Amino acid sequence: DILSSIWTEGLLMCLIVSALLLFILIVALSWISNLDITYGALEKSTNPIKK
Amino acid sequence: LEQILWRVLRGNLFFKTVEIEQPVYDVKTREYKHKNAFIVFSHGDLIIKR
Amino acid sequence: SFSHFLYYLVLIVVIVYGLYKLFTGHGSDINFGKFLLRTSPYMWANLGIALCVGLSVVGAAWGIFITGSSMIGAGVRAPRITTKNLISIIFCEVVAIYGLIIAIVFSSKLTVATAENMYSKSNLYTGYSLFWAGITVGASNLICGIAVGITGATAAISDAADSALFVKILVIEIFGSILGLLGLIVGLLMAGKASEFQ
Amino acid sequence: MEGVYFNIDNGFIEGVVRGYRNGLLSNNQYINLTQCDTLEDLKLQLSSTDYGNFLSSVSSESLTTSLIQEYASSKLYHEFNYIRDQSSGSTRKFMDYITYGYMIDNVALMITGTIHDRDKGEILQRCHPLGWFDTLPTLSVATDLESLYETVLVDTPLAPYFKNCFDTAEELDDMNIEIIRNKLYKAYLEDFYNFVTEEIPEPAKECMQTLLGFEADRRSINIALNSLQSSDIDPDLKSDLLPNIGKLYPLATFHLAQAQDFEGVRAALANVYEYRGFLETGNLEDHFYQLEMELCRDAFTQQFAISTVWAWMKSKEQEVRNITWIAECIAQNQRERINNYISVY
Amino acid sequence: FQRTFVNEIRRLDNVERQYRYFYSLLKKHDIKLYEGDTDKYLDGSGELY
Amino acid sequence: SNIYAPLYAPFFGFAGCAAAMVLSCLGAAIGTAKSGIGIAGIGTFKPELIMKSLIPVVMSGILAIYGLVVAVLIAGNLSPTEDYTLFNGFMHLSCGLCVGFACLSSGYAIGMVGDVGVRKYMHQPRLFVGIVLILIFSEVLGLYGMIVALILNTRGSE
Amino acid sequence: MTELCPVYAPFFGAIGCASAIIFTSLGAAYGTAKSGVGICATCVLRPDLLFKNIVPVIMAGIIAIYGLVVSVLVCYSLGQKQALYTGFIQLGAGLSVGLSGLAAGFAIGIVGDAGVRGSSQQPRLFVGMILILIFAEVLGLYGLIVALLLNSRATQDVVC
Amino acid sequence: MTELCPVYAPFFGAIGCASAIIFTSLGAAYGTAKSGVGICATCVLRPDLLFKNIVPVIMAGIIAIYGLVVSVLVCYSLGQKQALYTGFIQLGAGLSVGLSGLAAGFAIGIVGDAGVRGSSQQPRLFVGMILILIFAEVLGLYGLIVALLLNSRATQDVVC
Amino acid sequence: MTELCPVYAPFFGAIGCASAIIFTSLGAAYGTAKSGVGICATCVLRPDLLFKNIVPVIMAGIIAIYGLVVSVLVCYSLGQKQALYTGFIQLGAGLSVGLSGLAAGFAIGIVGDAGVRGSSQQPRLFVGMILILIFAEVLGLYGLIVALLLNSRATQDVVC
């Protein structure tokens, strides 16, 4: 009276754990992709109008 | 400068640039800056003036 | 958008697979019930404990940076707020302590079950109990931590304007902090009758 | 909701900017300022406020209303550039979009100031510093829109906005520049409004759409009134100067375009509630500044919204106008108008 | 601006501005400002001078 | 063994218990957070109005109590020593979904109304009685969820 | 036990019972929320109008009554040994009032917001808003009628 | 095979061991990057603050140390024939510190990014930054504590 | 087949071997690209700084070498009849160095780009950039350390 000859309880446990870890990884990379450098502070800009 | 002049002269630009090896001092700005010597060739009076 | 295309594709695949098994008469194969009986109870317990502290910490961290960034920004003109508003950071950090405490309590139940007793009534009950109890404490602390953090940002930016506003707005903050404590209480109730893995 | 993600980048900006808002002069401080005897007293009184020591380097006999305006404005611009420099991403785009309006005015000032023969040395001192771009003084080279476009303006962020300017005459005068100046503003606001609609989150989106809407309406009414000085103009030409994003659009803008006298314009506005009182009574100029401040004051009640940058800018700009008006009355010893500073806070 | 010793302060404020200006020139030409003895008057001692 | 009480039944009972408490907190969290922004928004302009306008926050807090009551009642019925039937498992699952999403929906409305309510109450002092009246209609949405949750729990164990 | 009455049959009924309240509550909340913004915005200038133009909130609130009424009716019809057919009917009844009530809520929210704002400018418009809201309201009533008809057949002529 | 020791049991140990260092590395990298830009943005005008302001990078580094410590500890308990109970203990230990450290690294980054900028304009504000930043760091420590607790039970009286 | 050595066991070995080099190469590519733009954008005015600004590229390059070492190490351990346990350990080692190296790649890329731009304005900032980069570089080293530990344990006491 098995669950399946292919989708055994052993395989499903591995997959849903993998799905959880992959979801956390994707969310992590989704935040990292949004790191924008604050260019304005790093590059000098000048004009003759200011003091 | 050369970007602007290229359009003004319709691509007939003959243009040379040479470095000055050390900063030049701009006392009114109280800073010193690098500079380049440059030269541009043309014959037309109105073109020279522009 | 690619992500929403993926969601619909998964949904369509699931529906078509379900209908295929159903129409061919083998609809009883999917059998979620058997899946819950055959999966080892240690998985449910450990996911409950790990996500309990995990989601609780995410809550505290998410709240802290919302309040902390506001305190530092508002503090440039008025440094006096930096020490008085540390209370707001505390209300964020504490929900991690609640998650930690539950992790201590639940850890006491992870004994080793005898093989002949592995899937018995009591052991399955403890497996389900610690999973949902851990999720409940974790998620509610995650929600609580963010809500407190958002409130703390408005409190800090108000304090920089007029000191009399701070005590008035902190009332909203303690109201927010109660959510995490109620989560803890329900967590201890759900896990109350669960026996150790026999 | 808004607060969950806003602070990942904008938390520091929002905190500092509201620090500035807490420094806006209150009505009580204005009242005190109006009772100074001399400019040297005004400096001492201002030193009590958030302005602090900003005039500490100026000699007693150097104090003049023009200089106070320059120093008070320079304080604002440095604070603006600091806030911009500490920003990134969509916020950086938003703050740059704020600058475009000023450099559009600089372009028109630069051209008109050289159609009449006076050298760039004077004009650059009259320019608004937030509107600087490195090729700006090169616009003194020529007196022809085609030449000015192909040689300079193509490189500027303003390039997309000239789509309707080249149809004009081959020769430039004050009237023709004023047509160009308004045609640019039309495309600028319509472009700015779209960027806000697309890439700015709530509640800033709704708030910012309101602020730009009022800005478009103010231009529309001013354009209509100014056109009445001309003998005649094609209504289908006027319609190209009115921006499309405002509250007056499309109904009132259509009637404004076809108006030929003050009563026509007054009738055109009478069907729009929010402005129904503007032309019937009092000074029109002050009414707009009154409504502008109230819209800014409303915007500050939001939080976790980048619109506070716009509210702070336009609010403190009005503060400089208040300071200089009071300073002029003090310097000229005539005070019957001194209480006409306009302030919500 | 109405406190009674305002004008006396203005004189000394103006001198303070000028001393700031002098110190700027010392730094422009890179000349070391000389150091006075911190204890030549008093150190919290209450000593009359 | 009783076929109506398979050993996996408690899973759905706990799932309902978790849904009851978590979603109720989400509703309460949104209601107080949105209201807090409104309360703080007027702070610099009219400090007097705060203490007499925390009503949205207090009402938003009641939503958490609705969740607590249902979660407590469910947790009181689950036990390892009783033949907790599968029918009871589904009933307690619906108990969580009802009170959970009812409180979540109510919390969202209380937040939206509360924010603009107090945030414009500073312009018009006669507005307040209207704000309270609208909030009550926003509040009862959560109450309806609790009513059905209590009825489901009453029938499930009998 | 019997094939017509699987032990999992109550699941569909239980989901239908919850569905009736989930979606109606979302409809009522959205209708209340966006109507409230309209009421609060207008009453600054026209506070005397408040109790007249509050009507949309009442209309949105009634949608939740529909969900409660259907939810209780199916709830009193659930049972440990109910047939599978009874489960499907209850699921259909729950979805019918649920998602139809959600549609009504969105309509009331949009119409109420615009109608209240307009009514502050033009008193003739109020009766117009009420008529349009009646048509929005009736979309909820149709869903209820179907739900009640379905529920009436949930146990008629059934055999275990 | 043995019912308590299925052949796939080591997977949860191996992936948990990897997860402990992977998730903490991503958290530490984000903290190092976001605050590192802030240090560059300020030091161009105030270079003397450089070595004073570097603390946020230091604290972000500690989060990775926690990940390395847990990863080493669980790694020393892997084995081919290990029980399934041991496997999920190792997964819980690795996931606990991993998910915890990931959040702590992000918070250190966002607070540190603001902190060093504020330090430039208001000298009293440096200590304020440090106080807040510790309570981001400790959130990684709580993850370590739970990991150590679970790991302590990995081999206690477990029998194949 | 002997259940401790299923036919599919080397699949995790192969993916572990490939993962070690793939993910680190993505990290090294991002570090080289993001910092490369900064170098070019600054050196047009300051060519004299070119060979001092190169360091961020070198460090980003080293990240790739970590993955090459691990990939070669696990590569020599694959086999037709390897144990499943050996497969999981090889997978864990590959992911450990791979995704940890990817995290380090992002950090070096961001701080490298910001660092060289700032270093053009303020020469005292270069030491600060190098100091921060080392903390980012070390994250990849932790990934290598875990990977080597796992690999050392991948083939002891196995009973294939």
What is the gyration radius of the CA atoms in chain D, in angstroms?
A: 21
Beta strands in chain D (DSSP E): none
F8-157: which CATH architecture?
Up-down Bundle (1.20)
Three-class SS state of D71: helix
D32: its two tokens:
């005190």
What is the gyration radius of the CA atoms in chain E, in angstroms?
A: 16
Contact state of H111 with C72 under an 8 Å Cβ cutoff: yes
Give the torsion sign (CA, I76, I80, I82, I83): positive
Q: For chain E, first and last CA: distance in Å?
A: 32
H88: its two tokens:
């999920």
From chain A, the residues in CB contact with H84 under 8 A are: none
| Whether H136 contacts chain C with CB within 8 A | yes
Cα maximum dimension of chain C: 73
Q: Locate tokens 């911009």: which residue?
A: D84
Within 13 Å, how many C-alpha atoms sit on residue D196's CB side? 27
Q: Where are chain F's structural domains?
A: 8-157
Three-class SS state of B40: strand
Q: What is the DSSP letter of H5?
A: B
Q: Among I121, H116, D6, I136, which residue's Cα sits nearest to residue A39?
A: I121
| The residue count for chain I | 160
Q: What is the DSSP letter of B15?
A: E
Contact state of D12 with H118 under an 8 Å Cβ cutoff: yes
Peptide bond before H10: cis, by omega within 30 degrees of 0? no
C71: its two tokens:
């305190």
| Kind and range of the H or E run holding D183 | helix D174-199
Chain F contacts in chain G segment 14-33 (CB below 8 A): 14-15, 17-18, 21-22, 25-26, 28-30, 32-33
CA separation (Å) from H96 to H17, H26, H60, I93? Answer: 11, 15, 18, 20
Q: Residue C63's closest chain D neighbor by CA?
A: D4
**Alpha carbon of residue H41 to chain centroid:** 26
Beta bridge partners of H5: H2
Write the DSSP string, D130-161: GG--TTGGGGGG-S-HHHHHHHTGGGSTTGGG
Chain C contacts in chain F segment 14-73 (CB below 8 A): 14-15, 17-18, 21-22, 25-26, 28-30, 32-33, 35-37, 39-40, 43-44, 47, 50-51, 54, 57-58, 61, 64, 67-68, 71-72
Give the torsion sign (CA, H141, H147, H152, H153): positive
C76 phi, psi to nearest 5 deg: -65, -45
Spatial distance between the Cα atoms of H84 and H4, rounded to a whole number of angstroms: 6
D325: its two tokens:
């008006």
| Kind and range of the H or E run holding E19 | helix E6-28
Give the torsion sign (CA, D311, D315, D316, D317): positive
Cβ count near I17 (within 10 Å) = 24
Q: For chain B, first and last CA: distance in Å?
A: 13
Given 3.40.30.10, 3.40.640.10, 1.20.120.610, 3.30.1330.40, which CATH number is that of C6-191?
Answer: 1.20.120.610
Are the C-beta atoms of residues G20 and G76 closer than 8 Å to each other? no
**Closest Cβ–Cβ partner in I99, I106, I110 for A37:** I110
Which residues neighbour H63 within 8 Å (Cβ) at sequence distance 6 or greater?
H24, H27, H28, H31, H101, H104, H105, H108, H137, H140
Q: Among D200, D7, I98, A17, which residue's Cα sits nearest to residue H106?
A: D7
Beta bridge partners of B18: B37
Q: Residue I151's closest chain H neighbor by CA?
A: H75
| Kind and range of the H or E run holding B36 | strand B36-40
As a 3-state breakdown, chain H gives helix, strand, coil percent values, each rounded to 5, of 80, 0, 20
Q: Locate tokens 């929005």: which residue?
A: G136
Contact state of H33 with I129 under an 8 Å Cβ cutoff: no
Spatial distance between the Cα atoms of H17 and H68, rounded to a whole number of angstroms: 9
Q: Locate tokens 């900028």: which residue?
A: H117
Q: Locate tokens 């926003």: which residue?
A: F138
Spatial distance between the Cα atoms of I116 and D67, rounded to a whole number of angstroms: 40
Beta bridge partners of E9: none
Are the C-beta atoms of residues I65 and I97 closer than 8 Å to each other? no
Three-class SS state of D39: helix
Are the C-beta atoms of residues I85 and I106 closer than 8 Å to each other? no
Within 13 Å, how many C-alpha atoms sit on residue B46's CB side? 3
Three-class SS state of D164: helix
- The amino acid sitting at C59 is G
Beta bridge partners of B31: B26
**Alpha carbon of residue G125 to chain centroid:** 26
Per-residue burial over C108-125, b if 16 or more Cβ lie within 10 Å, else e, is ebbebbeeeebbebbbbb
I130: its two tokens:
């190098």
Are the C-beta atoms of residues I103 and I139 closer than 8 Å to each other? yes
Are the C-beta atoms of residues H56 and H35 closer than 8 Å to each other? yes
- Strand-strand pairing, B24-26 and B15-19: unpaired
Beta bridge partners of B19: B36
| Whether H22 contacts chain A with CB within 8 A | yes
Spatial distance between the Cα atoms of G32 and G24, rounded to a whole number of angstroms: 12
Q: Residue D77's closest chain A neighbor by CA?
A: A50
How many contacts, defined by CB atoms under 8 Å, are there between C and D?
A: 61
Contact state of C153 with D12 under an 8 Å Cβ cutoff: no
D22: its two tokens:
């807490």
Spatial distance between the Cα atoms of D262 and D280, rounded to a whole number of angstroms: 11
Peptide bond before D203: cis, by omega within 30 degrees of 0? yes
Q: What angle do CA A35, A38, A41 make, to 5 degrees?
A: 165
Which residues neighbour D201 within 8 Å (Cβ) at sequence distance 6 or greater?
D2, D6
Q: Among I137, I140, I68, which residue's Cα sits nearest to residue I100?
A: I140
Q: Locate tokens 């109230």: which residue?
A: D294
Q: Among F152, F146, F122, which residue's Cα sits nearest to residue F53?
A: F122
Are the C-beta atoms of residues G70 and G140 closer than 8 Å to each other? no
Are the C-beta atoms of residues C41 and C126 closer than 8 Å to each other? yes
Are the C-beta atoms of residues G63 and G108 closer than 8 Å to each other? yes
- Strand-strand pairing, B36-40 and B31-33: unpaired
Spatial distance between the Cα atoms of D218 and H71, rounded to a whole number of angstroms: 65
Contact state of A35 with I113 under an 8 Å Cβ cutoff: no
Q: For chain F, first and last CA: distance in Å?
A: 20
- The amino acid sitting at D32 is N
Three-class SS state of B26: strand
Q: What angle do CA B35, B36, B39 make, to 5 degrees?
A: 150
Give the torsion sign (CA, E20, E22, E27, E31): negative
Q: Residue A51's closest chain D neighbor by CA?
A: D74
Chains near G, with 3+ CB pairs < 8 A? F
Q: Residue F37's closest chain D neighbor by CA?
A: D303
Which residues neighbour H83 within 8 Å (Cβ) at sequence distance 6 or greater?
H4, H5, H9, H158, H159, H160
Q: Among A42, C19, I122, C165, which residue's Cα sits nearest to residue F44?
A: C165
Contact state of A21 with H106 under an 8 Å Cβ cutoff: no
10 Å CB burial of residue D222 (0-12, 13-18, 19+) is: middle
Spatial distance between the Cα atoms of H124 and F9, rounded to a whole number of angstroms: 60
- The amino acid sitting at B29 is T
Q: Among F33, F106, F24, which residue's Cα sits nearest to residue G31?
A: F106
Contact state of C186 with F15 under an 8 Å Cβ cutoff: no
Q: Where are chain C's structural domains?
A: 6-191
Chains near B, with 3+ CB pairs < 8 A? D
Q: Among G53, G55, G63, which residue's Cα sits nearest to residue G29?
A: G63
Beta bridge partners of H48: none
Nearest-CA distance from H94 to chain I in Å? Answer: 12
| Kind and range of the H or E run holding B18 | strand B15-19
**Closest Cβ–Cβ partner in D88, D89, D132 for A49:** D132
Nearest-CA distance from D314 to chain A in Å? Answer: 20
| Whether C191 contacts chain D with CB within 8 A | no
What is the gyration radius of the CA atoms in chain F, in angstroms?
A: 19
From chain H, the residues in CB contact with C57 under 8 A are: 99-100, 103-104, 139, 142-143
Within 13 Å, how many C-alpha atoms sit on residue H68's CB side? 21
Spatial distance between the Cα atoms of D53 and C152, rounded to a whole number of angstroms: 33
| Whether I106 contacts chain A with CB within 8 A | yes
Spatial distance between the Cα atoms of G153 and G140, rounded to a whole number of angstroms: 21
Q: Among C62, I130, C177, which residue's Cα sits nearest to residue H110?
A: C62
Spatial distance between the Cα atoms of I118 and A39, rounded to a whole number of angstroms: 9
10 Å CB burial of residue C195 (0-12, 13-18, 19+) is: middle
For chain D, breaks with the C atom over 2.5 A from the next N come after none
- The amino acid sitting at F132 is V
Are the C-beta atoms of residues D105 and D129 closer than 8 Å to each other? no
From chain F, the residues in CB contact with D21 under 8 A are: 44
Q: Locate tokens 């379905």: which residue?
A: G150
Three-class SS state of H2: strand
**Any alpha helices (H) in chain C, and if so which ranges?**
2-23, 32-38, 41-74, 81-84, 86-107, 121-159, 164-190
Three-class SS state of H99: helix
| The residue count for chain E | 49
C154 phi, psi to nearest 5 deg: -65, -35
Q: Among D90, D101, D312, D306, which residue's Cα sits nearest to residue D198?
A: D90
Q: For chain H, first and last CA: distance in Å?
A: 10
CA separation (Å) from C54 to C132, H21, H88? Answer: 14, 15, 16
Contact state of A40 with D129 under an 8 Å Cβ cutoff: no
Write the DSSP string, F92-139: HHHHHHHHHHHHHHHHHHHHHHHHHHHHHHTT-GGGHHHHHHHHHHHH
10 Å CB burial of residue F97 (0-12, 13-18, 19+) is: buried
Write the DSSP string, A23-41: HHHHHHHHHHTT----HHH
| Whether D175 contacts chain E with CB within 8 A | no
Spatial distance between the Cα atoms of I78 and I93, rounded to a whole number of angstroms: 13
Q: Residue E14's closest chain D neighbor by CA?
A: D59
CA separation (Å) from G100 to G11, G28, G147? Answer: 22, 12, 10
Chain F contacts in chain D segment 109-148 (CB below 8 A): none
CA separation (Å) from C135 to C35, C158, C184, F89, I104? Answer: 20, 35, 11, 18, 32
Are the C-beta atoms of residues H20 and A21 closer than 8 Å to each other? no
Are the C-beta atoms of residues A13 and H88 closer than 8 Å to each other? no
Contact state of I107 with H29 under an 8 Å Cβ cutoff: yes
| Kind and range of the H or E run holding B38 | strand B36-40
Cβ count near G4 (within 10 Å) = 13
Resolution in Å, one decimal place:
3.4
Q: What angle do CA B31, B35, B41 make, to 5 degrees?
A: 145
10 Å CB burial of residue D264 (0-12, 13-18, 19+) is: middle
Spatial distance between the Cα atoms of F76 and F82, rounded to a whole number of angstroms: 12
From chain F, the residues in CB contact with C185 under 8 A are: 68
How many contacts, defined by CB atoms under 8 Å, are there between A and H?
A: 45
